[model samples]
Target chain A: DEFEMIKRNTSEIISEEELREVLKKDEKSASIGFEPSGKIHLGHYLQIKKMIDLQNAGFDIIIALADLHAYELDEIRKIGDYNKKVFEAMGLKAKYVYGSLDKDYTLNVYRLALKTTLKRARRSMELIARPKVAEVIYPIMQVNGIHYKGVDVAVGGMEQRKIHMLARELLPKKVVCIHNPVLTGLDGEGKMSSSKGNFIAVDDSPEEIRAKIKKAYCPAGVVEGNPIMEIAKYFLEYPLTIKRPEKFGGDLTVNSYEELESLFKNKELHPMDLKNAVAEELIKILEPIRKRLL
Target chain B: DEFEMIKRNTSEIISEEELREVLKKDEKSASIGFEPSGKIHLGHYLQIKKMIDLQNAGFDIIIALADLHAYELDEIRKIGDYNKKVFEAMGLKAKYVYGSLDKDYTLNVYRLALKTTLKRARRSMELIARPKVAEVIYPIMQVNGIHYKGVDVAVGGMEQRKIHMLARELLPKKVVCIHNPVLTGLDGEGKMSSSKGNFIAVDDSPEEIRAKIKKAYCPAGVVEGNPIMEIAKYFLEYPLTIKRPEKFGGDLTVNSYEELESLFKNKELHPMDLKNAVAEELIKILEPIRKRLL
Candidate 1:
C-alpha cells in the first residue's frame, strides 16, 4: 500500500512528463554511494525508491558500499565485512563497488586523503572526543576514494552533504555530485535512523510498517513537517496518480503533489484522517513488495 | 707494539688456538652486517679487518648494506630513495645480495608488521627512552626487522645488544646470538661514535688518524685500565700473535698478548714508544681497504 501511496503522492508532485525529462538528461551512467553505518531502514527506503526511479529512468547505475565509514562511526571492527553484508541484504550486489586506499599512486593520494579527513574531523569536532588522528582520517580516505575509482557521480543523504560539499571543493574537478534530500524519521523531528528507532527498513514486514505509521507524528491537515505525507508525496503518492476518496478528505487527484499538499494545508482535511488514509493507501500501494515478503 | 702487548695479555688468559676453534665452530660462515647509521669510520675498520681475518681462515663472507636500518635510524622522510644510494655505495649490488621488506609477505605485511611493532613497544622502554605510546611503536618496527630478514647471526656493538636481544627473543628458538665488543673511540674513554668526535672513520685522512691516536688515552705503567691496551687486546690480540722489542722490556715475537700487557702495565714500556708501535701496525693492517675509500 505504501508503494501505491508513493505512486499517488509522487504522481502529484512529479508529472510523468517531468520525470521523463529528468531521466533523459541523466541517461548517462550514475552511482549511488553511501556509508553503511547502520541498518537500511524505511527512511532509507524513501531515498532507495528515488534511486530505483532514477534507474527506471534509464541510467546505468552503481551502488558503492562504504564499509570503512561504518568503522569510523562506530568503534566496531569488521566494518568491511559488515558493509559487504549490508549491500547484499539491500539487493545492491549487482553493481557493488569499494575503494582501496593502500594502492600506490603517482601522487601520494593516501597522505592527501589523511590530511583532508583530519580537516573534516576538526570541523565536525569528532577529533575533540575521539582525539585519535586515525579516526579523522577515515572521511578523507572516502573523499579520495572518488578519485581512486573513476565515478561520474557520488550520492548521499543531507547529513553527508557537508562532507560531499567538502569533496566537491577538494576532489578533482572531473567528478560530479548528486545529493538527495534527507529522509526524516517517523518521529518527524530528526533524521531517520535505526539508532533513533525511527526507521522502517525496506525489509520490514507489513506489521512493522503499519506499527511505524501508527506511531508516526502526522496530524491531519497539517502538511508542514509531516513525515508520512513526505513519504507519501516523495515515494508513492507523487509517483503514482491514484486519486484519493473525497470521504478521506483529499482533493481530486491533482496534477502535482504541491497542489494536493496546498489543498490539505488550507484546512481542506483533518490531520488524523489524512494520516490514516495515507497509511491505508500506502499498504495497498506497497502490496507487490509486501507480498514478496510474505 | 700495542697489538703485541694486547695479544700477549689475551693469550695468557685464552689461548689463540682455543679462540680460533671457538670462532671456527660457532661461525663457519662469518658475515659482517653493519648498519650504516652514519659514514663508516675507523671503529668499523676493526670489524672489517676481523671479517677479513675470518675470510682468510676459510669462512664464507657476507656484507649486508643495512640501508633499511640506516633509514630508520636517520628517520629519513624519503627512505626508499635515500637508501638506494646507500646500498649502492656499500657494494651491495643485486648480485651480491640485498633485501626489501615488501617483497616477501602473504598479505599486507607492512600493516601486520606495524601491528606486531605496536605489541612489542611496551617492552622496549628502558633501552629507548619511554616515549608516548604512539611514538614507542617505531622502535619495535626498527628492531623487529631482524626476524623479517631471517638472519642467522646478528653482530653489533654492546649498545645494540639490547635491540639484538629483543630480536633474538622474538625469533625462533634455534637462532643463535653473537655480541661484538663495543669498539672504543681513539680517545678511548667512551664508545666510538660520530657524536663524541672521537671516531676514526675508515675514510679519515692519514693525518686525522695519527692526530686521533696522539690524543688517545694511553698512560704508561697502568695497562690494567688503559684504553690502548684494551683495544690491542680486544682488536688485535684476540686474533693475531703479538711481539714486542726487547728495548721496551719484552723479547721480540712474544707468544702471548698478556705477556706484552704485563710489561706495559708495570712501567717496563714507555707510553710514547707504545703509541708509535700501535699506530704503525694499525696503518699496515688497514692498508688493503684504505684505497677503497680514496
Candidate 2:
C-alpha cells in the first residue's frame, strides 16, 4: 500500500494513525529541509531514498535548501553549488531547493518566536548547541519553514524528532513526520555528519569511497550501530549477493536487511566480506553521481 | 554645544567622545524604534524629545515603528493606528515611521543571531521578561532594528542601555547611543509602560489625566524616587513662580530640577501644589495632541 511505502525503513511515522488520514487526501506533499553547509553523504541518501518512496506514492517533493539558515559568505555559495549539483545527481527533484528569503517568511518566524517560550524552544533545539541565540531561534526557523511550506508530511533524520515534535505541538495545521534512522558515523562515535568528517560524500570517488569504507569501524559480527552495514541497507537495493574468493566463504547472498543483519549478528558474515560488498555497492551507486557532477 | 542638547534630560550618551566624531560628519542621523503595540505617552514623549534634540543637531530622524516586530493581528491594527496618530500629534515627524518588512533585514537578524551568544543576548534583554524564546531573540531583534536603521545615534529609554551595549559590541558600525531617562510609573514601582496602565496616554482626556494624576504616587516632601517629581522634571519646564491664595503656601516653581528638589526637601513645596502645577503643564502640553487626534 501507499502507506507501507511511506512508512518503509523509517524510524517512526509519528502516529501512522493520522498519517493514514493524510494519505486519503488527493493532494499530498512532503518536504525535507537540508541546511546547505555540508556535503551530501550516505546519511543524506537515507532521507533521499525515503523521498523517492514518498514521490512514488504521489507526494510532491520539496527540498528546502536552508541557505539563509546556513549563515553565509562565499562559503555558502560554494556549499550551495555542491547541494544543487549533488542532490540533482542523486535523482532528487523539485525547487529542487527552496531557500526562502521572503519577507512573509521572516514575519512568520518572528511570530513563531513569540508564541514559543524559551523553555519550549530550547527543548525543541538540538541538545548539541549552535551558538547561544542560535540555539533557541534556529529551532523556530525550522518550524517556520515547515509551517510555511504547509506540507502534508515532513521527512527528516531521527535527530530532527524534537523539532518536528515542536511542529506537531505548535503548528496550527496537522503535519505527519517521518524520521529516517541516522547512519552511524564511520568512527562509530555518533551520527554521520559532514562537519565531523565522518561521512562519505555521495560524490566521493570510488577510490575515496573504498579507502574510507576500508578504515570504517565495523566490528566483527556486530550488526546494529554499524555504519558500513547501514550504508549497505539504506543506499543499496536489498538482496545483497556477497561474492568472496574461495578462501573466505565462496559466494553468499541475503535478501533483506533483517536477514543480512541476523547473519552479521550470528557471526556467519565476517566484517571484511561485509565491508568489501558494502563498499562495492556504494561505489556502483555513487559513481553516477560523481560522473553527473563532472 | 549640540552635545549638551542631545545629552539634556537623557541618562547618558554611551560615549560623548565618539559622539563628537559623529557630529563631524556632514550627514548625521538618529533613530528610535517604537514597537507599535501601545499608546504613545509621556514616556514615549521623553524619547521623542531626544529625537527632537538629535534633529536639531542636524541629525536626520528615523522612527522605526517596528510594526512587524509588534506581532500583529486586528489588535495590532488599533495599536498601529494610535502609534501613528499619537506620535505625529506629539510634534514628532518623519516616515513618520519606518516599518521595514524587508528580506535584507531578515537576513541580517539571523546573521546577528549566529554571532551573539545566548548568554549575551539574554544579558541584553529586558530584565522584565516577555515569553521564552523571546527573552533571547527579542533583544537581538532590537539590536537588528538598531543596526538596520544605521542611525548615527540611537535614542532609547535607559532600559535599552544593555541592548545598545550589545550593538556597540556586536554591530559593525559604531553608532552613538543616547538613552533617555525612564519615567517612573504612577505606582512608583517601575518604568511608565502602556501595558501597566500606570501611564497617561498622550490623548488621555483632561479629566482622565487629572483623575489618574490625582491618584498617582506623590510623596509629601520626597525629592528622589518620586514619580510626580520625576514627571515635572522630564515633562515640564521650570522657572521661579509662586502664586497661591497664601493659604497653604502660594504657588511655587523653581527653575531647575535640583532647585525644585531642594525646595521640596526644605518642605517649601507641598505635594498638592506640585501636583497642580504638573497637572496643568501636562494638560497644556498634551492639549495639542488631543486636538490633532480629534
Candidate 3:
C-alpha cells in the first residue's frame, strides 16, 4: 500500500527496485527542497501532494527552504516561515530546514562544487533557470542538502531529474530520486511557475480559480499539453463526474483518466466543459488549504 | 621613502591618488592573500616583500590563507599553520586569517556569488586556472576577503589584476589594488608557481639555490623574461657587485637595475655570469629565511 501511494500520479521513479527497497526499510525518509517563492501555487501543490503521499506511506519528510540565494536574512527567515505555514496548510507534515540556518549545509555545498564540473552542473540546469553561476550553485547545494538531510529518497518535479541524477552520482551517500510530472502552465507556455504568473495560487478563492481556468489555454480535441486535461489526470478520480446543461452532454461520468482523455481527444468533451470541471474540482480540493491559510 | 619602497618593483597601483589617500590615513591597512600552497617560494616572496613595504609604510597587514578549495580539514589546518610559519620565517609580520575559520567570510562569499555575473567572473579568471565552477567562485571569495579583512589596499601579483579590478568594481567599499610583477619561472614557461616546481623556495640552501639557478632558462643578450635578470632586478640593489673572471669583462658593479638590464641586453654580460651572480645574491637574500625555517 505504501509503495502504491508513493508510485501514484508520478511520471517516473529512478528505479522501481530501489524505491521498493526504501519502502521495505523500517524507517523511510525523503526530502523535497524549495527556494522561497513569492507565492505557493497549484504547481507547487503537485509536489506538496507527493510529500504528503510519502508521509502517509510512513516516510519521514524534510522540506528544505533554501535561503542562501535570498537577499536579506530577515527576508529569508520571514519567507521561510511563511513557506512552512503554506506547506502545513496544505497538510504537509514535514520537518523544515533552512540553508541560512545551517552553516554546515553551505559548507557542504561548497564541497560539492569542487566535485561538480561546470559543464555538468550547467547541463543539469538546461531545463531549469538561465545559466547564472548562482543558478549552477543552487543545484550543487540542493544535491548536498539531500546528503545533509540524510534522506533515503529525494523528490521533485521532472525538471529536477538531471540535478537529482547528478546528486545520485556525486553524493557520498546513496539516494533514490522520485520525479513527478511537471504541470503545464495556464498559458500553455512551459511549466507552471509564479514568475510567469501563469499558475493558480493554492490560496486562490473559488471565484479566482474559476476566472483563471476560464482564461486557460486549452485547444479543442487536444489531450496532450492541455492544462485542463493534465489537471484532471492528477486531481480527478474515476469515475469522474462532469456536470453540463441538458442541451449539452447533461451529466457525464468517466470511469478512468484514459476514458476521460479519449473523450476530450475525440471532441466528445468540449474544451470549455473540461475547463469548468477541472476548475470546480481544483477549487474543492484547495478549499481546506485556503481556509487554513486564511 | 616608505611610499617609494611600496611602489618599487610593483607592476601597477590602481591609482596613485588612492594610494596617497590611504597613506595619508593615520591607521592604514592592507591585505595579501594566498591559496594554501605546498611550498612558499620566491614567487610568493615577491608578494611578501610588498607586504613588508606596506608594513613599513604604517599599514597594518593581513595575510589571508584561503582554505576553501583545500581537500581535508586536517590538511588545511596543518598547511595553513605551515604557511604562516613560512611567512614568519621570511620575516613577514601580519595577522594570519584562514578562510575556513571565518564563517562570516563564507557568508560574504555567498553574497558575492549572487551579485557576480557568470560571464564577468569567468572573464576575470581567463588567464588563471582551468575553467571550473570553483575557478569562478575563487575570485568572489577573494573579493569578499578584501572587505572582510577591512583593508585599505589589496596586494597581489599581476595575474590577480583582473580579480582585483573586479573587486574594485563590485565591492561596496573602495579599495586600492597594488599589483606586483609576476616572477618568471626558472624554465621560462610561465609565472613561477610551487606546483610547477619552477621556483626557488625561501628556505632553499646555498647549494640547492646554485644548482637550480645554474639549470634555469636564461638566454644571452635577452634580459626580458630571463629568470636570472628578473631575480637580480628584485633582489639586487643599486651598486650591486657581480663576480666574474678577468677574461670575461672582470668584476663589475651596476648602479641600478636599468644599467644591469642594459648591460645584459647589449651582450656585455654573459648568461653564465648573470646566473652565477643571481644565485649568489638569492642565496644571501634567503639565508635568514633558511636559518629561521631550519
Measured against the true chain A, the candidates' chain A TM-scores are: 0.69, 0.88, 0.90
10 residues in a row with least lDDT, candidate 3 chain A: A100-109
lDDT of 1 by residue, B150-172 (tens): 43334445565555555555544
Candidate 2 regions off by >4 Å?
A: A1-7, A35-44, A72-95, A110-131, A183-294, B35-41, B73-95, B125-131, B184-220, B225-239, B246-261, B269-294
Q: lDDT by residue for model 1 over A1-294, one digit each (tens)?
A: 322322332313213343333444544455666566546565555555655654554555676655443224334334545544544444443365654344243133333543353334446333244333233333454555553255444555556655565666565544455555666678988878786567766556667677778888876678667887677666654433443466754544555667768766875655555555566666665555445433
Best by lDDT: 3
What lDDT tens digits, residue by residue, belong to model 2 across residues B1-294?
A: 887877778788777899999989999877788877556778888887778778778888887756544554555556766776776777667655555567577667777887898767766765664366756777777777773355787878887788789988878887888888889888788888775557888888988888778888888877666788888788777684645667886666677878888878887887777777778788888897789956
DockQ of each: 0.05, 0.53, 0.31
Q: Which scores greater on DockQ, model 1 or model 2?
A: 2
Q: What interface RMSD, in Å and to 1 decimal, does model 1 have?
A: 8.5
In candidate 2, what are the lDDT values of residues A94-210, reduced to their tens digit?
655556566566666766776888778767866584456776788887777773365888889888788889988777778888899888999899888885667898888888888
> For model 3, how does the per-residue alpha-carbon lDDT over A19-132 read when each residue is reduced to its tens digit?
898888899888888888878887788899899999888889898776645437676778778888889988888887776435464456666777888878887776665545
RMSD of 2: 5.0
**What TM-score does structure 2 among the candidates reach?**
0.77
TM-score of chain B of 1: 0.65
- Supply every candidate's count of residue pairs whose N, Cα or C atoms clash at under 3 angstroms: 49, 7, 0
Q: For candidate 3, lDDT tens digit of each residue in B1-294? A: 767888988898998788987898899888888887878888888888889888888888898777655437576677778888888887778887766434455555666777788888887775655545666676776676563356788888887787788888788778888998988999998999875557898887798899989888999999778888888888776788889988897898899989988898898899989899888888887897888844
